[model samples]
Target: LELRLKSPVGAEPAVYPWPLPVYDKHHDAAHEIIETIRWVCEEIPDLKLAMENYVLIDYDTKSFESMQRLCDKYNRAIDSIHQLWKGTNTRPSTGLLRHILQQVYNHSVTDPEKLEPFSPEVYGETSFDLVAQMIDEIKMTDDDLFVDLGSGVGQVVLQVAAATNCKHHYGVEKADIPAKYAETMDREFRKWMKWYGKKHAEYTLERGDFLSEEWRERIANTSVIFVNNFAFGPEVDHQLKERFANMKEGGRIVSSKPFAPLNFRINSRNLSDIGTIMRVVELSPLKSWTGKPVSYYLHTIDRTILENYFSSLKNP
Candidate 1:
């Protein structure tokens, strides 16, 4: 079996084996590779103009030698363009990052088992666009340490490590399947980044409970934390709030749901609450795996908020 990928730019047809290699139940490596090429070309106009547009596969007709030749040709064209960007401090374009991420995911998660819906093991993804936006707005520096709690396959950590100057990026996942996939995601991310001559910050993907005592201390030390707690239960959210309370001043947390109320007021009665210790703001127009227009929250630990509240009470 074989599949023919039509070239958008009307170039030489590239062919590949039929029934494209499956990365997971939902993703096919052939389709991802084709999309990656198109997206890479989209980011670098010269590559699109110089290279053939076809990414083809046919088990019956396409020979391994011919496919390798076509594949190498495309790779060389992309490499040349990538070479021009080397030594330049400019980060990769979102399109190129997206392509790289798709390739990494395709190679890493080869056998994704079914996850139970409405269970703690249920997995959801945050869209790349949303992550790009967060990276842009957060503006992590070399001194910052980033952590993603409940990180599924470590995609957010990988993307952030590549796109930001954070000193270190860590992703902790408790689920069995995703944590296992994250191990491979880490390897593939490193390999693909090297293959593309791109650079990324230090990162580690570990299988551990974010709510555990070890992570409690780690979370307190981290300058920036990302957690998709949209589906978490109230108890879990409460425990997370307790952990957030111990975070250092000026620490930031980005999450699908606000840990504190957006309009939270620091008062004597609520002085012990996490809302009193941090400022929460809503970032809108963000989309997630559900494809809905969702809002995410950014909470910055600022103890002065409580101090000001106390000063007001004394003056009044």
Candidate 2:
């Protein structure tokens, strides 16, 4: 009750530090929705942790059916509070809003085939904290642009902008489910920012192939780009290699698979080409989505326009 009345809308981080758990029959849509709200609220700092944790725990019960009823009631209350916070009476009623949110989140989870048609090897939802760590490791500044190719729900870009003062953030997601969800979330976030009067980094979200010529230009201007190329085949990878080679000199590429010749067959075939274009500077150790050890690479574009600019500087 107090939370809904006094809470500021958009100043808080939109993405949770952790990913949502998969729903089993042990829980229902209502329980899951409540958990989402509770988790998001908990992420706020300076909150009375003892009281909030007590209130958060007080709602829990063991029975699945009972839990659903409780969650439904709580959802209605929270929905009403959000509408009140927005100062909007024209919006849909709490019941309809809850149904829509529940449906969207549910469909995004259950519709596996439609989520990412680009590659079956592609997994859904990279861990949010992992992306945060990457942003910190790069030491991004307000002057630099951070981009996520194949950004999924735009969580990586959103989280980065929220955590840092990066000048611009961009996300490229060609998949339907993820693109739609990301667009909706982006719109809502803007509304929240307007109401909360908070400072947020400028962001652009596009629904198209990252390799498109238009997007390629955006890539060239970016200071840091992240790609999960574990599922990408050699042909697609060749295209990306060409793209990175032409990127602004000194720009960095972070990827799950090393761009260098690490494998025996690769070393025999294309290691020399990769080594010529990119300098392998760092091995960022991180866990894969499956909790397996999957370290990533930080490759600096060695011979691009930026390099020539620096060369001219030294000679002059």
Candidate 3:
């Protein structure tokens, strides 16, 4: 399970100065590579690392050529699916699954057993096409990890995975009934994917509170997170800020409303501290809440900058 990358030619053997123009992009690539190496090492405990001694005869045959070729293969596979769609005209399987699930969840209600531990949040599904459009605006890459907090029936999680082709998709719902339904939905969806040969990515759902330590650790490592806070109150904003602070630098959040919507506010509470960690970047023009044309705020996280700013505020 070891992946070896050929070093780019004309590679300099020295570290560049700080604040280099390409620092962020280069650091991101290095970080991804290091993380991948760590995972591989864990799998192949006795594996050794070494430099490969092959120089590319042609400049066009360098490192990213492999990535580009993989992308090309994916494109051809997608095109083949599109051609099959034109021949099939309609997907009766998907429509039938939707109908059956609709009836099953017709009496969907919050479970007292599940809500008693957490805040009294209702398990409402985020709007359909709206979630897709909002996720599109975020421009998530296939390497990103997308998570859905309070993922009722896990529909939005599946939609994000399908639309974005993200590497991993995770959904956690606090309510027992909806979470159970989501588990069933995930199994059924996997079956359909296997039958249709469309299992392009991995997805899973957990029946647990997002605020708990288990989910906090998961979200902390996530690249993009979606939260439908339409029914949440101001008190929950406190927890949202705490969660945002724990996210990795460059992580982002897409929320159905501002962190605190009590007084038409559109950002997270605990502004002095959380404000330094994350910022409301944009409104993703989505109607996930059904009442508004433009719904949800996009927030970006920068941990190093945030902690530094916080320290300056304290010292100065």
Q: For residues 1-316, could you state the per-residue lDDT of candidate 2 as single tens digits?
A: 1022122343443221123334434435444445545533443332323223444464544444444444444445445555665785122222333332333344344434444333312222234435545766788787788888888766566566656677888889988888877776677655443433444678887799988888778787888998888789898888888777667767888887787654323233443475655667545445233443546678877754334445665896
Worst lDDT run of 10 residues, candidate 3, spans 7-16
The residue-by-residue lDDT of candidate 1 on 167-254, one tens digit each, is 8999999999888888888887876665445678889999999989998899899999999898899999999999999999999999
Backbone clashes in model 2: 0
lDDT on C-alpha atoms for all candidate structures: 0.75, 0.57, 0.54
TM-score of each: 0.78, 0.61, 0.53
Error of 2 at 203 (Å): 1.4
Backbone clashes for every candidate come to 11, 0, 0
Candidate 3 total steric clashes: 0
Residue 140 displacement in candidate 1 (angstroms): 0.8
User: Candidate 2 has what TM-score?
Assistant: 0.61
Residue 123 lDDT in candidate 1: 23
Please identify which of the two predictions, 1 or 2, would achieve the higher lDDT against the true structure: 1
